[PDB]
């Protein structure tokens, strides 16, 4: 059903369905099963950031993540996107928790997008910016458990009045308006997104993750895809 | 019903509603009758650039309209918007021809909002840009008679296969997501708007103009507002 | 001799060259002795905000000045900066401290300026953003005791070694490139400026303030300005 | 002597210092010995853009360069600039004719830098966009013959009154501001240039190109660099 591209941050290692045995980063084309992945030294109560760039030139979509003060895990993968995706598509974050759990908070949000026609000084773009929510944020879809205004805060997953996170949750947030990805004129289309993001969790072994993806425009939380299928997949295929 | 603050072109003189003897530009506070107004030389099919913008501190909104190699025509009307408007609002362009006419046609459209608040480093931003449109223009809510595609450009009112404008026809094209245009710890609130036009009539005394305009989100055209009433307003009143 | 427009952040009452009794934000249109002030709650010790705007549809310059939870203060004055400056100058900031002293830190700065001419999509624009600074930083001027790199900081004034704010000290930091204001085809003509700013003072009086100012481009700091005349004005009149 | 990176659109085969035989795109690191080229199919007195772009994560400079209603011609490579360039460069355009000669016109130049740190909400980042050109530019270098204000364009080589492109003529710009390209805490660096261009020669054979580049901040025209050598190279090395 749904088509997704994301970048996940996946706190637990489910071996089983092919992570590594640690805190990695990875590109899902489709799949759970990333096409790639790389070490993440995730910090359970710092506020990280991630950067996510693609370009139609390189056909390369690649992340960084990063914490204050300490060293940056990065992943790419060589992947044409118009080959994978609808020309029309909305843009969210997903996060879910299972046995284990951890908060997946939102602390701010931007993206831009890029169509450079072949036309001279023809550029068609999209910028959202949000660095503070409101309780009634009526330019984000909210799937799920996702709620905003706590704190001027994206909540993915809900978390109970004194602050902790709660298992077996899942919730997504999408940008209103749909993101043209593609036109027949463009010589250049670029993306990139950036968020920061605390991950709290009270365990030694927190779980599951969040991801930053890109879907079909009508795409909804598939049936049994807490846990480890983040949100995003109806199963580990 | 709708709350509707425009900044319109206006070709006709409908000195009957109050406008001025010639072509002008005027600011509407919810009514046709502007309430500030510049005398405008419209020139018949040539390209020209609307700029509006506002502020928060300053609580003006002013604009600017300008043709290649020509004088621009500037108003501006000390309005604080909070006062006027809900916080979230749409954003778009309406049009319209009654008896006389012309083609309304937009070749560009941008538009820029920002939220600046007391916390540091917070600022909530949206930004579109339109150099290119698309048949199937998915992030626009096209109303009434207004289509795109056509040369890739937007057509607020009814262009028959020869180019020629029709007559009694009205057109709106709104952005899709809403726009937030106020929040409690925000500092300075702003917003630009930018676009250019064709207005083309093969008649002495085209008709009827231009507006952009902000409304509340679930806008649609009122009943009978070909004509003189832009495609914004139910009456003359 | 140097043509200065500037927006002070003055942090001590010099009643006997026309300060009111208490911290405040002014505008000072060649002159020390502000055209326009208001009462600006200083917080000793706390990051704060300042946003400076101006266009030339308007002719208004404002200024916004904000701390974290606290209540904003606003000045704004009209005046057409086309008749007072120069149409190519230089931006930067400035500070003094003279018997009483503070900490002037900058710990970031953006600023942007735009012309739009009356060609169709022709615009001229500037735009740095300084979120951290260098030991070396090749694109600002940097006179007086200004130095930078102490905590990717801006220090504008002397700062020993203990973190302590030294006295009759005086430093401005100017953006290397010139900028240009006007341009005769232009219809409008916009800047904005941010920055934020600690000051700290183990004194219950500090002294003496922060400015944004523009100048022309080859303005240094005049003889003996130290003090109440900011770096800026080589006298009290 | 200079460290020179550079996109070319060659027009002349000197397929002596190895050009294919036809006009063609090139990335020349440090030579004018291409390290990548592609076919380009020039086309005499039409407006053309190019776009350059780079990123630290791909270390892959590419470049797009497009007609209208044409087909683009794209060429790429793999290269760490922090391993070629200083950490402060200037970046500009030059141009050169030889024995055969063509304009070498710029009618618009934006470029965008941006270093993102690892601490939280960091970017630093510069963008100068000219859409239109004054006969005192004062925030670009002009060296050679580079002139500017001839129609509001910037004209690279020698063109004389009745609009002829003059042989043995070599032109470069290059933007006042130092650019920061790298600095110790980024987790990604990345540039953006897009400039549009008008070659036309009255000849069968046009010569010799024009080239976008990155070098060290002083650099200046080498000595006999007029003809197949750019502006940019001392010898065909």
Same mark, same amino acid.
């Given at each position: 059903?749904? +088509? ?68 940056? %895990? ?22 879910? +928790? ?6 997946? +908070? ?89 968020? +920061? ?13 969040? %991801? ?23 199963? %580990?295929?």
């Amino acid at each position: 059903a749904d +088509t997704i591209v994301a970048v996940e941050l996946d706190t637990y290692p489910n071996t089983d369905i092919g992570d590594p045995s640690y805190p990695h980063i990875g590109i899902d084309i489709k799949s759970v099963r990333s096409k790639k992945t790389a070490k993440w030294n995730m910090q359970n109560g710092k506020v990280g950031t991630a950067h996510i760039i693609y370009n139609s030139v390189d056909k390369r979509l690649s992340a960084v993540v990063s914490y204050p003060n300490a060293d940056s %895990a990065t992943v790419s993968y060589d992947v044409d996107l118009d080959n994978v995706l609808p020309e029309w598509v909305r843009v969210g974050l997903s996060a879910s +928790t299972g046995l284990y759990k951890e908060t997946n +908070t939102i602390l701010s949000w931007s993206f831009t997008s890029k169509l450079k026609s072949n036309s001279t000084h023809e550029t068609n773009a999209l910028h959202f910016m949000f660095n503070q929510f409101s309780k009634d944020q009526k330019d984000l879809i909210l799937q799920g458990d996702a709620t905003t205004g706590t704190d001027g805060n994206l909540e993915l997953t809900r978390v109970s009045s004194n602050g902790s996170p709660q298992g077996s949750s899942v919730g997504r947030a999408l940008f209103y308006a749909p993101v043209h990805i593609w036109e027949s004129s463009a010589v250049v289309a670029s993306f990139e997104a950036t968020f +920061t993001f605390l991950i709290k969790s009270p365990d030694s072994h927190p779980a599951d993750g969040i %991801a930053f993806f890109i879907s079909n425009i009508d795409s909804s939380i598939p049936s049994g895809s807490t846990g480890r299928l983040l949100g995003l997949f109806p199963d %580990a295929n």
